[PDB]
């Protein structure tokens, strides 16, 4: 037995993405616990210079709304969808006290969240951003961590948002491409090595008529890793 990595898809945004669906994926933000109305996936992405720019409008509402992109994930060549993987999304993100924004990078199975990596700045009076990781969906969701990122260290700029699975260990990272190191949270989740995945969604909402943060998405890929072969 030997092993290799198997890339399922790669979006570089040099051209309009193919093999994806717009505004029809799965979101994780538990609006029903926050006094908000249902999350909305709407609007376009603009592409320039190998970068996707999600578009939102300042429209007064009680919900998060922005564009999403989704795709399907087949089993690896060894016939497993419960195996190890890495899901990597490069972003450039910046904020300011008056700005509000959120992104989710989600892995799903049969229409439900399995893992959700979020970054958000949810107040128009503070420039604090928060990195969170959630496992499971809806009433079963468990927010594994809520990390208030110190702004002196987590400056505006380039990051790799990563979800990795290594058996029962689920890791979320926010790698600081510009300055080194970054955010890292790993949890050993009971039975997670038996839980499959079959899809992904990336969602980039703003809230109501609040001014948006600066966000762009430069690369996306998912790979099955440590895939047995003979």
Per DSSP, 38 falls in state P
Alpha helices by DSSP H, listed for 62-156, are none
Q: How far apart are CA 11 and CA 115, in angstroms?
A: 20
Residue 95 Cβ, how far from Mg ion at the closest point, in Å? 5
- Cα dihedral sign, 68-71-25-121: negative
Count, in order, helices (H) and strands (E) of the chain.
0, 18
Q: Considering the rule CB under 5 A, would residue 106 count as an interface residue with Mg ion? A: no
**Contact (Cβ atoms closer than 8 angstroms) between residue 196 and residue 76:** no
- Residue 37 is assigned to a ligand binding site: no
Site for Mg ion in 44-63 (CB under 5 A): 50
Number of residues that bind Mg ion (CB under 5 A): 7
Site for Mg ion in 116-155 (CB under 5 A): 121
- Residue 81 is assigned to a ligand binding site: no
Residue 27 Cβ, how far from Mg ion at the closest point, in Å? 21
- Residue 218 is assigned to a ligand binding site: yes
- What is the CA angle 151-156-160, rounded to 5? 105
Residue 191 Cβ, how far from Mg ion at the closest point, in Å? 36
Binding residue (CB under 5 A) for Mg ion from 13, 64, 109, 172 = 13
Applying CB under 5 A, the residues found at the interface with Mg ion are 12-13, 50, 99, 121, 218-219
């Amino acid at each position: 037995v030997k092993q290799k990595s198997e890339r399922v898809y790669h979006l570089d945004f040099n051209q309009t993405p193919t093999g994806v669906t717009l505004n029809n994926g799965v979101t994780a933000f538990p609006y029903y616990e926050h006094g908000n109305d249902a999350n909305v996936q709407s609007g376009p992405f603009g592409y320039a210079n190998g970068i996707a720019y999600p578009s939102t409008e300042r429209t007064a509402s009680n919900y998060w709304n922005g564009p999403s992109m989704s795709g399907t994930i087949p089993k690896n060549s060894n016939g497993s969808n419960t195996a190890n993987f890495q899901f990597v999304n490069r972003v450039n993100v910046g904020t300011n006290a008056a700005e509000v924004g959120r992104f989710e990078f989600n892995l799903t199975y049969q229409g439900k969240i399995v893992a959700s990596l979020a970054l958000f700045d949810d107040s128009a009076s503070n420039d604090q951003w928060v990195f969170s990781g959630t496992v499971y969906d809806g009433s079963q969701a468990q927010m594994l961590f809520f990390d208030l990122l110190p702004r002196n260290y987590y400056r505006d700029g380039n990051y790799n948002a990563v979800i990795t699975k290594m058996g029962d260990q689920l890791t979320f990272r926010l790698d600081r491409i510009d300055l080194g190191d970054g955010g890292i949270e790993t949890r050993t989740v009971s039975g997670f090595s038996s839980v499959p995945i079959d899809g992904w969604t990336a969602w980039f909402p703003g809230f109501s008529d609040q001014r948006g943060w600066s966000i762009n998405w430069q690369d996306s890929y998912f790979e099955w890793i440590n895939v047995d072969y003979w």
